[PDB]
Design an enzyme around this catalytic site. Structure first.
Site, PDB file in Angstrom:
ATOM      1  N   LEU A  24     -47.503  48.868 -20.797  1.00  0.00           N
ATOM      2  CA  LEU A  24     -47.842  48.633 -19.401  1.00  0.00           C
ATOM      3  C   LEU A  24     -46.951  47.521 -18.870  1.00  0.00           C
ATOM      4  O   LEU A  24     -46.967  46.408 -19.402  1.00  0.00           O
ATOM      5  CB  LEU A  24     -49.315  48.255 -19.245  1.00  0.00           C
ATOM      6  CG  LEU A  24     -50.359  49.371 -19.356  1.00  0.00           C
ATOM      7  CD1 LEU A  24     -51.755  48.774 -19.282  1.00  0.00           C
ATOM      8  CD2 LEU A  24     -50.183  50.416 -18.267  1.00  0.00           C
ATOM      9  N   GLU A  26     -43.667  45.183 -17.590  1.00  0.00           N
ATOM     10  CA  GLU A  26     -42.520  44.539 -18.213  1.00  0.00           C
ATOM     11  C   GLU A  26     -42.911  43.288 -18.999  1.00  0.00           C
ATOM     12  O   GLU A  26     -42.067  42.411 -19.219  1.00  0.00           O
ATOM     13  CB  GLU A  26     -41.470  44.198 -17.152  1.00  0.00           C
ATOM     14  N   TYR A 103     -58.586  47.894 -17.300  1.00  0.00           N
ATOM     15  CA  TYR A 103     -57.296  48.428 -16.878  1.00  0.00           C
ATOM     16  C   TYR A 103     -57.232  48.485 -15.364  1.00  0.00           C
ATOM     17  O   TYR A 103     -58.167  48.986 -14.723  1.00  0.00           O
ATOM     18  CB  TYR A 103     -57.104  49.833 -17.454  1.00  0.00           C
ATOM     19  CG  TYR A 103     -55.949  50.622 -16.835  1.00  0.00           C
ATOM     20  CD1 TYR A 103     -54.640  50.138 -16.878  1.00  0.00           C
ATOM     21  CD2 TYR A 103     -56.182  51.860 -16.269  1.00  0.00           C
ATOM     22  CE1 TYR A 103     -53.584  50.882 -16.348  1.00  0.00           C
ATOM     23  CE2 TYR A 103     -55.136  52.610 -15.726  1.00  0.00           C
ATOM     24  CZ  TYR A 103     -53.853  52.116 -15.787  1.00  0.00           C
ATOM     25  OH  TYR A 103     -52.839  52.873 -15.244  1.00  0.00           O
ATOM     26  N   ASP A 161     -52.670  28.684 -12.232  1.00  0.00           N
ATOM     27  CA  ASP A 161     -51.544  29.469 -11.718  1.00  0.00           C
ATOM     28  C   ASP A 161     -52.056  30.618 -10.866  1.00  0.00           C
ATOM     29  O   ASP A 161     -51.662  31.774 -11.020  1.00  0.00           O
ATOM     30  CB  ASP A 161     -50.651  29.958 -12.857  1.00  0.00           C
ATOM     31  CG  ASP A 161     -49.319  30.553 -12.362  1.00  0.00           C
ATOM     32  OD1 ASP A 161     -48.828  30.222 -11.249  1.00  0.00           O
ATOM     33  OD2 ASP A 161     -48.752  31.362 -13.124  1.00  0.00           O
ATOM     34  N   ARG A 165     -49.216  37.382  -8.046  1.00  0.00           N
ATOM     35  CA  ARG A 165     -48.786  38.067  -9.270  1.00  0.00           C
ATOM     36  C   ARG A 165     -49.815  37.981 -10.401  1.00  0.00           C
ATOM     37  O   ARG A 165     -49.699  38.719 -11.387  1.00  0.00           O
ATOM     38  CB  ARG A 165     -47.453  37.502  -9.725  1.00  0.00           C
ATOM     39  CG  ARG A 165     -47.554  36.049 -10.111  1.00  0.00           C
ATOM     40  CD  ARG A 165     -46.197  35.394 -10.051  1.00  0.00           C
ATOM     41  NE  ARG A 165     -46.255  34.002  -9.630  1.00  0.00           N
ATOM     42  CZ  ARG A 165     -46.565  32.995 -10.431  1.00  0.00           C
ATOM     43  NH1 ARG A 165     -46.852  33.192 -11.707  1.00  0.00           N
ATOM     44  NH2 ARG A 165     -46.592  31.761  -9.939  1.00  0.00           N
ATOM     45  N   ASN A 166     -50.822  37.117 -10.269  1.00  0.00           N
ATOM     46  CA  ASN A 166     -51.901  36.990 -11.239  1.00  0.00           C
ATOM     47  C   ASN A 166     -53.210  37.574 -10.729  1.00  0.00           C
ATOM     48  O   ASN A 166     -54.286  37.218 -11.220  1.00  0.00           O
ATOM     49  CB  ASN A 166     -52.094  35.522 -11.636  1.00  0.00           C
ATOM     50  CG  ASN A 166     -51.049  35.075 -12.617  1.00  0.00           C
ATOM     51  OD1 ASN A 166     -50.593  35.875 -13.418  1.00  0.00           O
ATOM     52  ND2 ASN A 166     -50.643  33.816 -12.553  1.00  0.00           N
ATOM     53  N   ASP A 179     -55.381  36.305 -16.284  1.00  0.00           N
ATOM     54  CA  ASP A 179     -54.705  35.199 -16.976  1.00  0.00           C
ATOM     55  C   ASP A 179     -55.378  33.856 -16.727  1.00  0.00           C
ATOM     56  O   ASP A 179     -54.705  32.831 -16.631  1.00  0.00           O
ATOM     57  CB  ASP A 179     -53.225  35.108 -16.590  1.00  0.00           C
ATOM     58  CG  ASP A 179     -52.322  35.638 -17.671  1.00  0.00           C
ATOM     59  OD1 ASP A 179     -52.741  36.601 -18.352  1.00  0.00           O
ATOM     60  OD2 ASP A 179     -51.217  35.076 -17.864  1.00  0.00           O
TER      61      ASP A 179
HETATM   62  C1  LIG Z   1     -43.289  40.281 -15.992  1.00  0.00           C
HETATM   63  C2  LIG Z   1     -43.289  41.660 -15.337  1.00  0.00           C
HETATM   64  C3  LIG Z   1     -44.585  42.474 -15.547  1.00  0.00           C
HETATM   65  O1  LIG Z   1     -44.803  42.977 -16.592  1.00  0.00           O
HETATM   66  N1  LIG Z   1     -45.528  42.578 -14.439  1.00  0.00           N
HETATM   67  C4  LIG Z   1     -46.787  43.329 -14.407  1.00  0.00           C
HETATM   68  C5  LIG Z   1     -47.503  43.338 -13.213  1.00  0.00           C
HETATM   69  C6  LIG Z   1     -48.689  44.051 -13.097  1.00  0.00           C
HETATM   70  C7  LIG Z   1     -49.161  44.771 -14.194  1.00  0.00           C
HETATM   71  C8  LIG Z   1     -48.445  44.777 -15.390  1.00  0.00           C
HETATM   72  C9  LIG Z   1     -48.944  45.591 -16.596  1.00  0.00           C
HETATM   73  N2  LIG Z   1     -50.333  45.269 -16.889  1.00  0.00           N
HETATM   74  N3  LIG Z   1     -50.678  44.180 -17.562  1.00  0.00           N
HETATM   75  C10 LIG Z   1     -51.988  44.178 -17.651  1.00  0.00           C
HETATM   76  C11 LIG Z   1     -52.808  43.120 -18.323  1.00  0.00           C
HETATM   77  C12 LIG Z   1     -53.459  42.303 -18.832  1.00  0.00           C
HETATM   78  C13 LIG Z   1     -54.325  41.207 -19.380  1.00  0.00           C
HETATM   79  C14 LIG Z   1     -54.585  41.157 -20.739  1.00  0.00           C
HETATM   80  F1  LIG Z   1     -54.032  42.125 -21.526  1.00  0.00           F
HETATM   81  C15 LIG Z   1     -55.380  40.135 -21.248  1.00  0.00           C
HETATM   82  C16 LIG Z   1     -55.922  39.171 -20.348  1.00  0.00           C
HETATM   83  N4  LIG Z   1     -56.729  38.079 -20.524  1.00  0.00           N
HETATM   84  C17 LIG Z   1     -56.931  37.504 -19.342  1.00  0.00           C
HETATM   85  C18 LIG Z   1     -57.766  36.243 -19.104  1.00  0.00           C
HETATM   86  N5  LIG Z   1     -56.296  38.201 -18.393  1.00  0.00           N
HETATM   87  C19 LIG Z   1     -55.650  39.236 -18.993  1.00  0.00           C
HETATM   88  C20 LIG Z   1     -54.840  40.279 -18.503  1.00  0.00           C
HETATM   89  F2  LIG Z   1     -54.560  40.391 -17.182  1.00  0.00           F
HETATM   90  C21 LIG Z   1     -52.524  45.321 -17.029  1.00  0.00           C
HETATM   91  C22 LIG Z   1     -53.978  45.761 -16.903  1.00  0.00           C
HETATM   92  N6  LIG Z   1     -55.058  44.914 -17.418  1.00  0.00           N
HETATM   93  O2  LIG Z   1     -54.255  46.809 -16.411  1.00  0.00           O
HETATM   94  C23 LIG Z   1     -51.386  45.992 -16.551  1.00  0.00           C
HETATM   95  N7  LIG Z   1     -51.445  47.233 -15.831  1.00  0.00           N
HETATM   96  C24 LIG Z   1     -47.250  44.068 -15.492  1.00  0.00           C
END
Ligand SMILES: */C=C\C(=O)Nc1cccc(Cn2nc(C#Cc3c(F)cc4nc(C)[nH]c4c3F)c(C(N)=O)c2N)c1
Length: 303
Positions: A24, A26, A103, A161, A165-166, A179
């Site tokens: 998922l 980058e 997700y 933060d 983007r978070n 995060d």
């Molecule tokens: C640096 C570029 C990049 O990869 N950007 C980006 C933006 C939006 C979505 C993604 C892919 N993606 N990552 C996640 C996630 C997550 C996640 C964890 F695995 C664990 C966590 N713990 C905490 C406190 N927060 C967490 C977290 F957000 C997901 C998703 N969850 O669906 C996706 N789609 C990459």
């Protein structure tokens, strides 16, 4: 296998119930892959749920492992809320550590908003644009983030933060803070170093965090003000054209970003209040939630 990974029977999912899929994104949030979990819900053992699975890289140190465990354990202590990314389970036996979380299929909030820009704001960078958001949709976005932060602050969690983007967006358009479970680095940090997506986190920092590394709930409220600006520019880049060393100067001398073109005076004044120089004089997340609740109800869904 070398380490004592903590098995919590309430959260542990057998390895065989996780069907791993594509990576998922980058890698902003770690090595995250999409997966299907079978019988996450113990009352529905034959149903599959799409989930995100965080794991460690091949080069991971014992420090990266302890951090991931601590993040998992912190999510348990913080508890569940609709507007944060929630823990769903973990795999700690018979293979590498997996941490399973909700997700979010529509990306982070910056990307979500940019793809919904009208072709007329900065340009829409998406090759498959999505339908435009109403004014009410945007305020509701802000409300949901505020509600997630109000919950986190109630659990004594400081994000440090908070930025578009978070924030991740689910298939049902729910905003979820991401995060938040991360332990604060014990070292000093570089003010100019981007993330892997190239963000420059110093532009979301309150001045007391910038100058003295003091982070409080009040400094998250400052960041929330920057996020509000990001929402109403539909994913704009803060302080356009301002280099870091300028930014330090400018904030001290008391200027603030200009109001977005499409933003009400009332929401701009909420931004400015979040950017009070004096931490004690900023609104709390409790107040922001109450005010955004009211503004949502009064804001038109028609444009
Ligand atoms: C640096 C570029 C990049 O990869 N950007 C980006 C933006 C939006 C979505 C993604 C892919 N993606 N990552 C996640 C996630 C997550 C996640 C964890 F695995 C664990 C966590 N713990 C905490 C406190 N927060 C967490 C977290 F957000 C997901 C998703 N969850 O669906 C996706 N789609 C990459």
């Amino acid at each position: 296998s070398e380490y004592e990974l903590p098995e919590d029977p309430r959260w542990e999912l057998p390895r065989d119930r996780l069907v791993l899929g594509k990576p998922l994104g980058e890698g902003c949030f770690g090595q995250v892959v999409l997966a299907e979990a079978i019988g996450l819900d113990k009352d529905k053992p034959n149903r599959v749920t799409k989930v995100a699975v965080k794991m460690l890289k091949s080069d991971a140190t014992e420090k990266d492992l302890s951090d991931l465990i601590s993040e998992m354990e912190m999510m348990k202590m913080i508890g569940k809320h609709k507007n944060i990314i929630n823990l769903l389970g973990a795999c700690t036996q018979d293979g590498p550590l997996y941490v399973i979380v909700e997700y979010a299929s529509k990306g982070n909030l910056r990307e979500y908003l940019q793809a919904r820009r009208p072709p007329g704001y900065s340009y829409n960078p998406s090759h498959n644009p999505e339908e435009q958001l109403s004014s009410k949709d945007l305020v509701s976005c802000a409300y949901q983030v505020a509600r997630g932060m109000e919950y986190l602050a109630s659990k004594k969690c400081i994000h440090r933060d908070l930025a578009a983007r978070n924030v991740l967006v689910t298939e049902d358009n729910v905003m979820k803070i991401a995060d938040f479970g991360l332990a604060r680095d014990i070292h000093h940090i570089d003010y100019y170093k981007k993330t892997t997506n190239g963000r420059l986190p110093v532009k979301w920092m309150a001045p007391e965090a910038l100058f003295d590394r003091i982070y409080t709930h009040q400094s998250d409220v400052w960041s929330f003000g920057v996020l509000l600006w990001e929402i109403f520019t539909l994913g704009g880049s803060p302080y356009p054209g301002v280099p870091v060393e300028e930014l330090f100067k400018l904030l001290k001398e008391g200027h603030r970003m200009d109001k977005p073109s499409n933003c009400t005076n009332e929401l701009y004044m909420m931004m400015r209040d979040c950017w009070h120089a004096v931490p004690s004089q900023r609104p709390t997340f409790k107040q922001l939630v109450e005010d955004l609740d009211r503004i949502v109800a009064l804001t038109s869904n028609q444009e």
